[PDB]
Amino acid sequence: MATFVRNAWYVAALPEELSEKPLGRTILDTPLALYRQPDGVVAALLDICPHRFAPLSDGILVNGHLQCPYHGLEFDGGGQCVHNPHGNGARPASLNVRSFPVVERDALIWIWPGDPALADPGAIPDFGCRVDPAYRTVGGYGHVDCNYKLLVDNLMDLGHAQYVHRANAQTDAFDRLEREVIVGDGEIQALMKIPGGTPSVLMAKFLRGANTPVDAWNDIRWNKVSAMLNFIAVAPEGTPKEQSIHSRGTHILTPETEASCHYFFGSSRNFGIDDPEMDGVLRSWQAQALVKEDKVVVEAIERRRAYVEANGIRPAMLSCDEAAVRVSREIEKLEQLEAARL
Amino acid sequence: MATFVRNAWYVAALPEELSEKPLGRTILDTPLALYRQPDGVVAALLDICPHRFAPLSDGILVNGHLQCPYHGLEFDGGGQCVHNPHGNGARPASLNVRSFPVVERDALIWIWPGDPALADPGAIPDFGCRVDPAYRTVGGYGHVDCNYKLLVDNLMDLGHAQYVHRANAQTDAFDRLEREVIVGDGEIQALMKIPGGTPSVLMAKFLRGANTPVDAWNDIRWNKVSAMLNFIAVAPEGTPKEQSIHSRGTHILTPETEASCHYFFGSSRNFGIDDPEMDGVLRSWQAQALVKEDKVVVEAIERRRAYVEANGIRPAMLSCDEAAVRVSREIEKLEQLEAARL
Amino acid sequence: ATFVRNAWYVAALPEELSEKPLGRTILDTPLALYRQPDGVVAALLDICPHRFAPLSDGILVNGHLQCPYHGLEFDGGGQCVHNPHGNGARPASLNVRSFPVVERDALIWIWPGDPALADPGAIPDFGCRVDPAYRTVGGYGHVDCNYKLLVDNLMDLGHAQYVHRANAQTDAFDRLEREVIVGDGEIQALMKIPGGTPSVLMAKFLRGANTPVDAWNDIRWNKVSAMLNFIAVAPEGTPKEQSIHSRGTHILTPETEASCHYFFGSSRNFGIDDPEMDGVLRSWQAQALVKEDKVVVEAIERRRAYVEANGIRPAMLSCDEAAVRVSREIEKLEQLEAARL
Numbered sequence A, B: 001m002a003t004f005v006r007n008a009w010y011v012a013a014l015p016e017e018l019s020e021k022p023l024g025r026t027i028l029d030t031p032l033a034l035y036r037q038p039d040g041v042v043a044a045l046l047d048i049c050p051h052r053f054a055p056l057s058d059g060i061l062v063n064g065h066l067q068c069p070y071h072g073l074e075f076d077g078g079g080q081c082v083h084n085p086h087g088n089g090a091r092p093a094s095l096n097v098r099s100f101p102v103v104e105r106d107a108l109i110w111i112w113p114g115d116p117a118l119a120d121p122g123a124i125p126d127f128g129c130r131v132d133p134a135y136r137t138v139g140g141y142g143h144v145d146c147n148y149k150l151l152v153d154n155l156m157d158l159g160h161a162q163y164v165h166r167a168n169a170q171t172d173a174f175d176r177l178e179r180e181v182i183v184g185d186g187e188i189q190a191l192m193k194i195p196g197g198t199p200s201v202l203m204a205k206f207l208r209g210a211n212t213p214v215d216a217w218n219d220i221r222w223n224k225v226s227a228m229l230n231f232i233a234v235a236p237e238g239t240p241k242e243q244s245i246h247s248r249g250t251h252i253l254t255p256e257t258e259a260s261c262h263y264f265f266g267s268s269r270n271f272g273i274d275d276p277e278m279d280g281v282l283r284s285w286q287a288q289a290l291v292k293e294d295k296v297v298v299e300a301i302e303r304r305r306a307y308v309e310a311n312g313i314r315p316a317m318l319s320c321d322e323a324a325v326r327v328s329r330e331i332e333k334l335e336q337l338e339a340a341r342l
Numbered sequence C: 001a002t003f004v005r006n007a008w009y010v011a012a013l014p015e016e017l018s019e020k021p022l023g024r025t026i027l028d029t030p031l032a033l034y035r036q037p038d039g040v041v042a043a044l045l046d047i048c049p050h051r052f053a054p055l056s057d058g059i060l061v062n063g064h065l066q067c068p069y070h071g072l073e074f075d076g077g078g079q080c081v082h083n084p085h086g087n088g089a090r091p092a093s094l095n096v097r098s099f100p101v102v103e104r105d106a107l108i109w110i111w112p113g114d115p116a117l118a119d120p121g122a123i124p125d126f127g128c129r130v131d132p133a134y135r136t137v138g139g140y141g142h143v144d145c146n147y148k149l150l151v152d153n154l155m156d157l158g159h160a161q162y163v164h165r166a167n168a169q170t171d172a173f174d175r176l177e178r179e180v181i182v183g184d185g186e187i188q189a190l191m192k193i194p195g196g197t198p199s200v201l202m203a204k205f206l207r208g209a210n211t212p213v214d215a216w217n218d219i220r221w222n223k224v225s226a227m228l229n230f231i232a233v234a235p236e237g238t239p240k241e242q243s244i245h246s247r248g249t250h251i252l253t254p255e256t257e258a259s260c261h262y263f264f265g266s267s268r269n270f271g272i273d274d275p276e277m278d279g280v281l282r283s284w285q286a287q288a289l290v291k292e293d294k295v296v297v298e299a300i301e302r303r304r305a306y307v308e309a310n311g312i313r314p315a316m317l318s319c320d321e322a323a324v325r326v327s328r329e330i331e332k333l334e335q336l337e338a339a340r341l
């Protein structure tokens, strides 16, 4: 296949998307059949029947077993063929289908598409806020026609806020930014404190009313490959970013093909937990910003890749590209390390 | 090199599809202009004008001659340029267009897309029942986005009936009771007799007799490349076979591209010959079996070919795959034999 | 792909440009075309130097095209005139490629190749389009065929007898008199349809006047793919040198190897104040060009794979002289350029 970092955990779906009716979805050019078994456990099988290659995702569950819609072979969550209705009903090993390591955690469905012997659920990113009773989480799914790295670049960058999300987050006090970049093992963080300018649209609706040279906060954490969690906050007194009013944003990308990807987004609130109106506001921003703004930009950039590559054009970095560049380099190393292993 | 067996007869159309208005259709990646001349004889020309390559199929007949819609060159059924309206009206040999051997027989339009010197109308499969006054034939055409071999596999197989054609073709009285596969020269037959009695709703209404147990038959014949004729029958007591209530089903495939094909189907009844109403029902059930059922499965499988090939995945055969496997091997040989020739 | 990059091509009609950028691809090169506040047209590579966003999706800010992604601003020459980030430094690496552009004869010409070779002496003459003595109407069409197929089409005005049958058929066809004049960077194909019944279309040009007449359908080709035809019809043996006519603009600009832009127009010498005659011409352009010719060339493009896979070559007729010579000139230009770099 192309260049993907297969040895890592990726989100394949949101829990609400799975049920007894299989979901067919492609991850890193690998077609998967994702479904929840009767015992509530999620299973992930290669969406290719071992017999004649029909999509198992088009089948239904029979006694908790996924049945191939073509000739009826039945499989368990581990991919073992548990029933062959033909002939003497023999089930040779050649009839088992490939099963992928899968972990449901933090209201996310994680999958390991690479070497199964190398998985290890302990390396899965921490998105605990998504199931923390102290937070209220709302979110969704989006499909985007761009290489996932373009969206990683996007999420790791604050600059476009002023233009891409013009109508929304356009701080007239964005000329006085400050951004710290922390590098760790398979982890990078861009932290920013913002003490100035009475909001505009976004934070406004999140807020109520305040003013002082020290309030806002905008941060983002990146974990190995393409899983990010941001931190959007605002508060009164010289109180730490803690005790503040904030939303931790889930922004996770999973490559589908070399030129397309899956986008799992969400907002985990610390305020208005029982307020349905805020839920709307948040979902209204996600649909606007992430689906009606960032998508348009990255999809247009993807359409220009052929030209940039055909010619020897390289990007010209600005002062605000530090975080994105470092993440980009880490992802590159991971690709090389894996290619070397091969 | 998409790999087609060019030296063989293929159905390019049903008689009802042809008239004085040319039909443009691609067979084995070869664009053809098919039309019936004023004398009623069908002609098949390469759909590429010798002059500047315009589609002759977009032209009209002028005095029984197909006129190119671009600059007016006129051709006869043999591809000879019979009129050049330009200059001195000279007609050099370079102006003739390629003509394909074509035979209208058994209410089918047969064409030889390969080496014309090797044709021979005598090798054409026998589908006499289609024009036998003792039978009533109804049928149609269907386009499918799958390599033709996937549909050949399908037609040569009885095991998916229960799941794909779920009920209409379902029969718990089908089980698995000895399927005889006879291999000939350019012909293969899969014979299956089911002593138990379970006649379709249509044929049962003809058993009459005087209350008697009945046997049933589900046979199919395959001829060189991809032309099949099945035998669905039922009869009482000492069930002979040729004196039973039956339908001979025409199921012929013709490759369009490497990943698409033409499907010509039909039913030749031996019962209810004077039931125009029954005509619509039988054609509708075949259309349903193709469009809403077999098509969905084979097109999904075609969508998985890239992955299976990129990886080294081979199919895992079951007890019920004997007939399909043998036909598949015969087609393979034919490809090799032809590849060896040139 | 094989394109002759060192030549002027029409990238748009003036009416298509404004302060809102137009994104259009020419010879596989994405362009951002727009008219600055001073009225001057600019043509920039539609790829921001920073992170490659389409500048054509941006808006003008103080006469400067602003990238919609992170706000870099550029002038008509591609110079980055404003960087809102950091210390606002503007290193040379931030400038975007600008293409030589000339607005002339109600056409927007662009040089997509080596900018140092842009030789304006080569911009074709289409003066009739802005000559107050003529009335011009026209439009744009996108076609899914290699541009050379449409060049062949336009250089064979004879196809009108069949392709444009319902409007161009003539009974005096077998009496045609065609000649081919070759010259320095220019080729002309002349056609004369002697004293015959005016064609349906020529009838309209003559407000329904079915009386013996002489017809003319000439065409001029200039370096690469810019053509201007001459459709005239006049009584008995009157001279065409001074007749009722229409000079047809037929210019093609490759988009990709298998697609192109078609800029067409009609510059009348009659019924200048007759809007119904405008409709007659627009109708013809919509039917014949955007439909009739398109249907034919698009079908031919669909057969290229087969013809090439096999070793099929076209069989030329007596009426192919002009098209063949133009085809050979274009070939030479490709070779000359391939030889250069």
Ligand SMILES: O=C(O)c1c(Cl)ccc(Cl)c1O
Pocket (backbone or CB within 6 Å): A161, A169, A202, A230, A232, A247, A248, A249, A250, A266, A267, A282, A285, A286, A289, A290
């Ligand atoms: O989608 C988010 O997590 C988000 C929100 Cl809720 C508010 C503001 C910004 Cl700049 C965001 O990126």
Ligand SMILES: O=C(O)c1c(Cl)ccc(Cl)c1O
Pocket (backbone or CB within 6 Å): B169, B200, B230, B232, B247, B248, B249, B250, B266, B267, B282, B286, B289
């Ligand atoms: O499609 C057919 O030829 C057919 C018919 Cl008409 C009746 C019953 C069965 Cl089981 C068939 O496979």
Ligand SMILES: O=C(O)c1c(Cl)ccc(Cl)c1O
Pocket (backbone or CB within 6 Å): C157, C160, C168, C201, C217, C229, C231, C246, C247, C248, C249, C265, C266, C284, C285
């Ligand atoms: O659009 C044109 O220039 C044209 C007209 Cl008006 C009449 C006939 C032909 Cl063949 C043309 O190409």
Ligand code: FES
Pocket (backbone or CB within 6 Å): A049, A050, A051, A052, A053, A054, A068, A069, A070, A071, A072, A073
């Ligand atoms: S393809 Fe799955 S049982 Fe046959």
Ligand code: FES
Pocket (backbone or CB within 6 Å): B049, B050, B051, B052, B053, B054, B068, B069, B070, B071, B072, B073
């Ligand atoms: S392409 Fe057929 S006559 Fe010219």
Ligand code: FES
Pocket (backbone or CB within 6 Å): C048, C049, C050, C051, C052, C053, C067, C068, C069, C070, C071, C072
């Ligand atoms: S991509 Fe244009 S300013 Fe960033």
Ligand SMILES: [Co+2]
Pocket (backbone or CB within 6 Å): A064, A065, A076, A082
């Ligand atoms: Co079980």
Ligand SMILES: [Co+2]
Pocket (backbone or CB within 6 Å): A083, A084, A085, A089
């Ligand atoms: Co069983």
Ligand SMILES: [Co+2]
Pocket (backbone or CB within 6 Å): A085, A086, A087, B159, B176, B319, B320
């Ligand atoms: Co079986």
Ligand SMILES: [Co+2]
Pocket (backbone or CB within 6 Å): A154, A160, A164, A165, A289, A290, A294
């Ligand atoms: Co954004």
Ligand SMILES: [Co+2]
Pocket (backbone or CB within 6 Å): B064, B065, B076, B082
């Ligand atoms: Co004849």
Ligand SMILES: [Co+2]
Pocket (backbone or CB within 6 Å): B154, B155, B160, B164, B165, B289, B294
């Ligand atoms: Co079937």
Ligand SMILES: [Co+2]
Pocket (backbone or CB within 6 Å): C064, C075, C081
């Ligand atoms: Co300025």
Ligand SMILES: [Co+2]
Pocket (backbone or CB within 6 Å): C153, C159, C160, C163, C164, C288, C289, C292, C293
């Ligand atoms: Co034309």
